[PDB]
Design a protein around this nucleic acid. Sequence first.
RNA 1: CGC
RNA 2: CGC
Lengths: 434, 430
Amino acid sequence: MKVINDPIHGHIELHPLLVRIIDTPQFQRLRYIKQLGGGYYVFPGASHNRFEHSLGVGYLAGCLVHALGEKQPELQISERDVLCVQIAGLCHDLGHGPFSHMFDGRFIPLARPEVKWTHEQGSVMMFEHLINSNGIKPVMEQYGLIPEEDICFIKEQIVGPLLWPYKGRPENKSFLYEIVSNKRNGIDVAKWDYFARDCHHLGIQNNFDYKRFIKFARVCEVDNELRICARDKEVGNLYDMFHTRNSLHRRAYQHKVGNIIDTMITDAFLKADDYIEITGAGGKKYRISTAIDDMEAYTKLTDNIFLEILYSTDPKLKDAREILKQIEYRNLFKYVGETQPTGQIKIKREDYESLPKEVASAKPKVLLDVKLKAEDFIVDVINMHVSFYCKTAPNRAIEQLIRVYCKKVDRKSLYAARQYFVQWCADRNFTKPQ
Amino acid sequence: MKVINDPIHGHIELHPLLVRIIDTPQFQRLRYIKQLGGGYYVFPGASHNRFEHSLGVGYLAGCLVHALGEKQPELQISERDVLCVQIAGLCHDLGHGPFSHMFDGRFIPLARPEVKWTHEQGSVMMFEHLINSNGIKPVMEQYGLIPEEDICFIKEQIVGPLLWPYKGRPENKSFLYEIVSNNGIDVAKWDYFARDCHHLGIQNNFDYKRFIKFARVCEVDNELRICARDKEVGNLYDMFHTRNSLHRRAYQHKVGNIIDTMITDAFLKADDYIEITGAGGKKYRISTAIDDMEAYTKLTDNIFLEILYSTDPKLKDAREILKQIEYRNLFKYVGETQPTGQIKIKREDYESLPKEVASAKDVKLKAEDFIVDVINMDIDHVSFYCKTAPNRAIQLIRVYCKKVDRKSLYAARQYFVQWCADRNFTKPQD
RNA sequence: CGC
RNA sequence: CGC
Ligand SMILES: [Zn+2]
Ligand SMILES: [Zn+2]
C-alpha cells in the first residue's frame, strides 16, 4: 500500500480503498479550503488546508480502532470495521465550504436565514456524490465491504443518527461511533489531528501526546454502554490536551483581527452573491449561497472564489472586489466591543441577519452628531465527562461571545458605534461592555 | 513596531516602512503561490506559500545586518542600510510566478524560447511596480531613506549588477551585498531550509542563530566578506548536508517533478485562451503577463483552478490534464541521464528535446508522447576567522511518457537510451 | 488592529 | 508509480 509522509504523523499507510476515495475531485477539493479560514491573514504559518487534516483524521481513526482491536479481541473488530472508520475519518470534512467554518458558521446564515445547513450534512451529500460519480461501491465490495450498510455506517459517524438509534452497527459496537467525532464529550481523533497540526503551523506548543493515549485506551462497561476509556494514570495527558484546546481558541480561533477578517470575506461574498455563477449538474447555474444545493457545483466552490472576485473586472462585482482590496491594504473593519448573553438564549443563526438593525435602532440618547445605518455595523456571534479505568480492574469504571465592528473608521462613528453597542446590550440584557 | 508570530522564527518585529510594503496587492500576491510548486501534490505538509517565506527572509536579513553593525561599529552600518537590506529580503521573491520555480524554470522556456526571463527580473519589475502603485517613495523619505539611490541598492541586492559594478552602495560596504543572496550562503537559504524542513518533516541540523551571532566581516583579498567563526565549521557541514538532503528528497522528487510537468503542459495548452487584463485594458496571456506587472499581479496559482473549473470548450485539453492530476493518472517515468562532460542543456533548447527523443530510434511514439525535464541545482569560497585574530581569515535530465500501456512504455525506454547515445549522455540504470 |  |  501507499505511504504519505506527513510532518505530524510521519509515514501514513493508506489502504488501496482509501486511495481511490482520495483520488477524486470531490476529495482533492479539500486542498483549496484553508483549515483556519481567514486566520491565515493573521498567522502566516496557518497555510494548511482541509486535505492534510483529513488524511490525519483518517489515519488516527484507524490507529485507534486497530489498537483497540488487538488488545480486546472480544470486541470482534473486523478489518471491515477498520476501513469504515478510516473512511469516515477521511471524509468527515468533505462538506466544508470556502474558508471552512466561516462558510456554514456565518455566510450561509446571513445569505439564506431560512435554510438550515451544516458542513456535516454537506459531508454526507458530498460523500454520496463522491461514491456515485466514481464507482466506489464495486471497489468497496472488492475489498470486503457491504455497501448498503457500510455506507450507512460511514454517514452516521459523520452526521449522527437520523432505544438504540443507529442502523449501521448494532449496540455491541457503539464504541465505534465515538472515534471520528464524539458528540458527548468532544474527545475524538479529529481534535487530536488539528490540535497537533494547528499548533505546528501557529507555533503554539502542544503538550498532549496522542500516541500514549491510543496506547492505553480500552473499551469498558459504563452504565451498560461500551465506551472508550483512558487509563486512570493518564489524567495528566488529558489535562494537557484541554489546555492546548483552550490556548488555540483563545489565541487563534477567536483572534480579534482574524474574526474581523472573516466577516470582511463574508461581506464581500454577500455583495458578490448575485453575480457569481457556478455551473452545477445539467448546466444549471448556482450562486455562492445556492451551490450547497447541488453537489456538482459545490465541488467547484472553494477558496478560489476569493481570487475570482479579487481578479474580476466585472462592474457588478466592484463592491465585492473593493471589500477584498481593503483586506490587502489592511484597512479592516474596526473593533467596537464585546458582550455575553446572560443566562439567555443562544442567539440563533436565523437571527444573525436582524442583529445589525437592532444595533442601529438602539437609542443612545446621549445624542451626538453622527448617526449610523445597519450596513455600517457588523455583528459577530462566536459559538464555542471522561470515564477512566484502573489497571487492577480493567473493565470496571471509576459559551457565546458577541462582537460588534463598524465599517466606518472615523473617530466619531467609532465613538457613536460604541454608544449604540453599549445601548444595544442593555436592551437585550447583555453584560456591560468595557 | 508591529509583531508577526511565525512558526520558524517566533516573533518578527516589523518597522513601519516594511508594513507599508507588505500591505500592498503586489506583496500579498505571494499568499497565492506555493513555495514548492507542484511538490504539494506529493508532500501534504508543503502547503506553504511564498509570502510567509518572504517575511522570514526580511527578518533573517535584518538579524544578520543588525548583529554585524552592533558588533563591528567600524563598518558604519546605518539604519538606512538595515532597512534597505530588510526590504531586499522582503521583496527578493516578488517576481515568482504560478507554482514558483515551475514557472520560470520550465514554462516560460517552453512557451517563449526567445525571451530570457528570471523571477529575480520579475522581482525588480514587481518592486518598482509596488513602490509606485502605493506611494512608497514619500514613506521611504519620512523614514530617512534616499529613494533614488536606495531603490537602486535594493534592486541590486535582488538581481545583481548590470572595477566596482554596483552603484547603490560604495565598495566599503561590499559585505551588504552578501546577505540576501550570494558562494551560496545567505539568509534566503536559511529561511527555506528551516521552513521546508518544518513542512516536509525532514530534520534541519543547521542552526542559523549560531551562525548569525558569531559572524564577522573581515578583509579577504582586498574585499570585505562575511566570515564565520572557526568553531562554526561543523554547523556549515550540517548546512551543506541538509541542503543536499532537501534537493534529493524533495526538490528532485520523481513524482513531484512529473506533476510539475503536467501543470506546465496544462498551461501551454491553455495559453492561447486565457485573458488577463493588464495596464490600459490591454490583454495578456499566461506567457506574456511577465511583460506587464499589472497583469502579473493577477497571475497566481489560481490560474490552475480557473482552468480546472472552466467550461470553455477551448480549454478542454488543458482542463483534462488537470483532471488527470486529480485522478492520479500521471505521466510515466522512463529514465534518468546526465550530460557528463558535455555542454549543459540550455533553456532555449527545452522545447526541441521531445522531438529529438521521437527522432532517435511494433508500437511507435511521437513527440506528443515525450516529456523531457531538465533538473538543475543552480568546501571553498567560505572564509573562517579565529578568536585571537578577529580581522583576518584563513544537471539531471529525465524523460517521461504520456502513454501508460506497457507496450508504449517499453518502446519509449529505447527511444530514450538511443537518444543519450546520440548526445554523449550516460546510459541509464534500472 | 498579523502585540 | 504521494515508498
Ligand atoms: Zn475535522
Ligand atoms: Zn527565496
